[PDB]
Amino acid sequence: REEEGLPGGPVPRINWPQEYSSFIDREPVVAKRIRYDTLASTTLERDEKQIES
Amino acid sequence: DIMVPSFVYNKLPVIHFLQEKRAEQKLRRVLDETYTEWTEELDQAHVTDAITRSLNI
């Protein structure tokens, strides 16, 4: 995945256009987008050389 | 020259048998004390969760 260039972190299978229509208030929807967008922009990986050491 | 030798010769078989049984008992005890110890290591999911919290997500 890194060679291809896709985001390292997991990405949920969501259709935010539907979520916007479903929810009445944007605040929870915007917060959810902020969390997932931040999650998809971070590499949840550790250095397994030091860990094994 | 005659008596003690004869009685020693008579003793030999039983002692040999008993010592063989004793050695077998030692080997059996050695085997019986062997248990495989399965160690438990901190699940990496908690590490991933703590990483997420540190990000302020």
From TrEMBL, chain A:
Domain of life, per lineage: Eukaryota
User: Which protein are we looking at?
Assistant: Uncharacterized protein
What species is given as this protein's source? Answer: Trypanosoma brucei brucei (strain 927/4 GUTat10.1)
Which part of the complete sequence is present?
Answer: 160 to 212 of 370
UniProtKB/TrEMBL annotation, chain B:
Q: Which UniProt keywords apply?
A: Membrane, Transmembrane, Transmembrane helix
The entry's cellular-component GO terms read: kinetoplast; mitochondrion
Presence of the UniProt keyword Transmembrane in the record:
yes
User: What domain of life does the native source organism fall in?
Assistant: Eukaryota
What name is this protein filed under?
Uncharacterized protein
* Organism listed in the record: Trypanosoma brucei brucei (strain 927/4 GUTat10.1)
